[PDB]
Structures are given as structure tokens and as C-alpha cells.
């Protein structure tokens, strides 16, 4: 109800996902690590309690060995990532 | 109706290669005890046989493909589109002429049903 | 909705988590992504491990197979109900 929604908003604003609340406040890009060693850099448009994120204008980079591995990357306009494959989520990336 | 159509096509192919109106390959076959009821104009198949003979005569034209090759109809889609547009314009003009003829017939029927039929004068 | 019950009792092929494909008549399903495939056949691809060797797929028929939802990845339709 309303009390459960207020408790969910308090847990999203003051809990572990509050950095994810930084993704929807100032629209800043976040760095999410996947299970297949694919780092996704981009802001989050929508989130939930199960860490399911909706990213807009994201860039997915990974290392693929053909020797030395190359940093082959791609750019997606809109994407959705489940919370089961999320390993580490960084609020402020380096570059 | 395939055998009669094949016989009509054979008669149209044999009559188109004649050098005269009555000196053909079908006028002499009528006196050779060969029954051909499609040569008489009283039958309904004579109107189709005349169209088949006209198509066989048009297939022997010098631009029909015997001594020349068509380039505008075979290697120009714009010429075919212009011909289709001219045919559509001719069909629209024929439909407008038919509508004008129907309007004139309706005006004549309105004028004939409104005239006085009691003013009789014998001179 | 009832999209899972629309393809019931048809010759469907479900992809496993290990890479195998089980083709059979999925007659019964549940909410936990379980499948009851009557006259099922599982095909698993073998690695060539060479330069000139080709890639083959060993197929074995088991009959009625009860596949759990923890190993099933995706199910596709292959053939109509006979």
C-alpha cells in the first residue's frame, strides 16, 4: 500500500541502492559489471528491488581474445539488464 | 472446346499468309470436301476467327519481331509507364464521353416525355 | 496469459543449460518451467578437438522425460502433433 511504497522509497533512497538513486537524480552514468566480464557504462532510467535496471545510451565493453585480446565494444540505445547477472555497480566511473 | 480453338488458330495461321482476299489456303479447302463451318460469318465463332486472323496479321508486322527488334517496349520502363498513363487517360476520356452520352440521352428522354402529343397537324 | 498452454502436446525442442537439445511431445507443464516430453530424444554436440575433424551430435531417445526448470533455457516448436 502507501506505507509499503514509502518503506520501499526509503530503502531506495537510504539503502544500498541509493547510488542507483544517484542514477535517476542527476542522470549520471554508472558502471555495471556482468557475469560474462562485460562492463556496461551508462545511466539507469528505471530500477527495482531485484536490481533489474533499464539503461539508456549504454556502452558495453569486453575483452575478446582472437596473441593479445582486443577491447571490442558496442553501443546500445536502450537496454534492460536483470539483477541476477549484476556483480558490481559503480556510481562514479573514472572515464 | 480445345479442338475447335486449335482448328480456328490453324485456319487463322493459314489464312494470314495469303496474297489476296479470296486466293487463300482456306477457300480451296472448302471445295476439297473439308467441312469448315467457321468460315461463314453467320456463326458466332466467326467474330473470334476474325480477331485471330487480325492478331496473326499483326504478328507479321515489321516491328512485330520478324525483321526488327523493339527497344522502347523492351528496354525502357519509362516508355511503358508513359504508354500506360496514355491508356489510362484514353480510358478516362472514353468514360467521360460515355457519361456525356448518357447525360444527353437522359436530356432527350426528359424532353421527349415533356412535349405535347396532342397538337396534331397533317399537311 | 496462457501462452505456455498454447503449444501443449506438440513436438517441441527445448534447449538445455549444458548445450543439449531435447525434442519431444511436451504434454504437461507447470509454473516452475517443468516439461513432460513423451517420446523425447536428447541430442548433445561433441567437440571435434582437431583441425580436420567435423562437429557431430550424438542423439539418444529416452521416452517420457521430466525436465526441470533449472536446466531448461529455451523451448522452440519443431513439429505438429501427430
Amino acid at each position: 500500500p502507501e506505507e509499503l511504497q514509502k518503506r520501499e522509497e526509503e530503502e531506495f533512497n537510504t539503502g544500498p541502492l541509493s547510488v542507483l538513486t544517484q542514477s535517476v537524480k542527476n542522470n549520471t552514468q554508472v558502471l555495471i559489471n556482468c557475469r560474462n566480464n562485460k562492463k556496461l557504462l551508462g545511466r539507469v532510467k528505471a530500477f527495482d528491488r531485484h536490481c533489474n535496471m533499464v539503461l539508456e545510451n549504454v556502452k558495453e565493453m569486453w575483452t575478446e581474445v582472437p596473441s593479445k585480446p582486443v577491447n571490442k565494444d558496442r553501443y546500445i540505445s536502450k537496454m534492460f539488464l536483470r539483477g541476477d547477472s549484476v556483480i558490481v555497480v559503480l556510481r562514479n566511473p573514472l572515464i | 472446346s480445345a479442338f475447335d480453338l486449335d482448328v480456328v488458330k490453324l485456319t487463322a495461321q493459314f489464312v494470314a499468309r495469303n496474297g489476296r482476299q479470296f486466293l487463300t489456303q482456306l477457300m480451296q479447302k472448302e471445295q476439297r470436301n473439308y467441312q469448315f463451318d467457321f468460315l461463314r460469318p453467320q456463326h458466332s465463332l466467326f467474330n473470334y476467327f476474325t480477331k485471330l486472323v487480325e492478331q496473326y496479321t499483326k504478328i507479321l508486322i515489321p516491328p512485330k519481331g520478324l525483321f526488327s527488334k523493339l527497344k522502347k517496349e523492351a528496354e525502357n520502363p519509362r516508355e511503358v509507364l508513359d504508354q500506360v498513363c496514355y491508356r489510362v487517360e484514353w480510358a478516362k476520356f472514353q468514360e467521360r464521353e460515355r457519361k456525356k452520352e448518357e447525360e444527353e440521352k437522359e436530356k432527350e428522354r426528359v424532353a421527349y416525355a415533356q412535349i405535347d402529343w396532342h397538337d396534331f397537324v397533317v399537311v | 496469459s496462457s501462452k505456455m498452454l498454447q503449444h501443449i502436446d506438440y513436438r517441441m525442442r527445448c534447449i538445455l543449460q549444458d548445450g543439449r537439445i531435447f525434442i519431444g511431445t511436451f504434454k504437461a507443464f507447470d509454473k516452475h518451467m517443468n516439461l513432460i516430453l513423451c517420446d523425447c530424444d536428447e541430442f548433445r554436440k561433441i567437440k571435434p578437438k582437431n583441425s580436420k575433424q567435423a562437429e557431430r551430435e550424438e542423439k539418444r531417445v529416452l521416452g517420457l522425460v521430466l525436465l526441470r526448470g533449472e536446466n531448461l533455457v529455451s523451448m522452440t516448436v519443431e513439429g505438429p502433433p501427430p
Partner: protein, 80 residues
């Protein structure tokens, strides 16, 4: 709010669901449930280092799907 309700309100959209074991199925998603079960029709599936095959119908589960890719002509404000 949960993200399953935003994914359940999607019909006749050409999306691309990338699975966990190197599989990616691109097709028109026709059905989505609360358990993230994606039922699509006339899709193309490409496995890990394999040829992309074409399937008339497919039904991917919720736990086997790793990521999703939506087209650019899809508003996220009205779906949430």
C-alpha cells in the same frame, strides 16, 4: 516498482534477448509474464560460436535470460 510490469506491457516489439550461455535471440516478442517468460515468434537465435538459425516460435525462461535490447523507438516514461 518492479521491472517485470514494464516488460510485461510489450507486444509486437522486435527486441533482442541475450541469454546466459552465449545465446542471443532477436525477434518480435509476443508474450511476457510475471516470471519474465518471453514468448516470441519468427525469431533468429545465435549460440556461442554457432550459425544463426531461424525459428518460427520460441519461449525463453526468466532465469536463462541475461540481458535485453529494445529499439530506439520505445519510450521508457510511459512504460514505468
Amino acid at each position: 516498482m518492479k521491472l517485470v510490469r514494464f516488460l510485461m506491457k510489450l507486444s509486437h516489439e522486435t527486441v533482442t534477448i541475450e541469454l546466459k550461455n552465449g545465446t542471443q535471440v532477436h525477434g518480435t516478442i509476443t508474450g511476457v509474464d510475471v516470471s519474465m517468460n518471453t514468448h516470441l515468434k519468427a525469431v533468429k537465435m545465435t549460440l556461442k560460436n554457432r550459425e544463426p538459425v531461424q525459428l518460427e516460435t520460441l519461449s525463453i525462461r526468466g532465469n536463462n535470460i541475461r540481458y535485453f535490447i529494445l529499439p530506439d523507438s520505445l519510450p521508457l516514461d510511459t512504460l514505468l
